[PDB]
Design a protein around this motif. Structure first.
Motif, short mmCIF file in Angstrom:
data_model
loop_
_atom_site.label_atom_id
_atom_site.label_comp_id
_atom_site.label_asym_id
_atom_site.label_seq_id
_atom_site.Cartn_x
_atom_site.Cartn_y
_atom_site.Cartn_z
N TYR A 190 -3.84 -10.65 -50.21
CA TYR A 190 -2.83 -11.56 -49.69
C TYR A 190 -2.49 -12.57 -50.77
CZ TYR A 190 -0.59 -15.19 -46.92
OH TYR A 190 0.31 -16.12 -46.44
N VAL A 191 -1.23 -12.61 -51.18
CA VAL A 191 -0.75 -13.64 -52.08
C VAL A 191 -0.03 -14.69 -51.25
CG1 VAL A 191 0.75 -14.15 -54.02
CG2 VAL A 191 -0.59 -12.06 -54.03
N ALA A 192 -0.46 -15.93 -51.38
CA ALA A 192 0.11 -17.02 -50.61
C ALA A 192 1.59 -17.19 -50.92
CB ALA A 192 -0.62 -18.31 -50.95
N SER A 193 2.34 -17.59 -49.90
CA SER A 193 3.76 -17.82 -50.06
C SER A 193 4.11 -19.29 -50.19
CB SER A 193 4.55 -17.22 -48.88
OG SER A 193 4.17 -17.83 -47.66
N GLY A 194 3.17 -20.19 -49.94
CA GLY A 194 3.46 -21.60 -49.98
C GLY A 194 2.34 -22.42 -50.57
N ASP A 240 -1.33 -22.05 -47.72
CA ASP A 240 -2.05 -20.81 -47.51
C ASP A 240 -2.92 -20.47 -48.73
OD1 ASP A 240 0.58 -20.38 -48.58
OD2 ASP A 240 0.68 -18.35 -47.74
N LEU A 241 -3.87 -19.57 -48.51
CA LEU A 241 -4.86 -19.19 -49.50
C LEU A 241 -4.59 -17.77 -49.95
CD1 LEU A 241 -7.68 -19.51 -50.92
CD2 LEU A 241 -8.66 -18.63 -48.85
N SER A 242 -4.54 -17.55 -51.26
CA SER A 242 -4.45 -16.20 -51.81
C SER A 242 -5.84 -15.63 -51.97
CB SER A 242 -3.80 -16.21 -53.19
OG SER A 242 -2.50 -16.76 -53.15
N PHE A 243 -6.00 -14.35 -51.65
CA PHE A 243 -7.30 -13.71 -51.74
C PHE A 243 -7.12 -12.22 -51.97
CE2 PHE A 243 -6.12 -14.15 -47.27
CZ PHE A 243 -6.20 -12.86 -46.81
N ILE A 250 -5.09 -18.54 -43.87
CA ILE A 250 -5.00 -17.10 -44.05
C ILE A 250 -4.50 -16.47 -42.76
CG2 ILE A 250 -6.84 -17.11 -45.73
CD1 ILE A 250 -8.62 -15.74 -43.56
N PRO A 251 -3.83 -15.32 -42.84
CA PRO A 251 -3.50 -14.58 -41.62
C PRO A 251 -4.75 -13.98 -41.03
CG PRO A 251 -2.35 -13.69 -43.54
CD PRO A 251 -3.35 -14.65 -44.05
N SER A 252 -4.98 -14.24 -39.74
CA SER A 252 -6.23 -13.83 -39.13
C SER A 252 -6.38 -12.32 -39.07
CB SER A 252 -6.35 -14.42 -37.73
OG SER A 252 -5.29 -13.93 -36.94
#
Length: 60
Positions: free
Chosen positions: A11-15, A18-21, A51-53
């Protein structure tokens, strides 16, 4: 208190908040009050953010 989850997908954060991981990263879930976005802390990078759950599952 310890609530370890593993990332199922990248997941790359958009803002800003949010957290990229990366897939396979282990995260401490800090705030799961909302069902869609959880505050998480990466045990790998030390970054913290939402993060999106549905991108994570419970883990050791």
């Amino acid at each position: 208190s310890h609530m370890t989850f593993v990332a199922l997908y990248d997941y790359v954060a958009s803002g800003e908040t949010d957290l990229s991981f990366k897939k396979g990263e282990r995260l401490q879930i800090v705030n799961n009050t909302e069902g869609d976005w959880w505050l998480a802390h990466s045990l790998t990078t030390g970054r913290t953010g939402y993060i999106p759950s549905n991108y994570v599952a419970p883990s050791d």
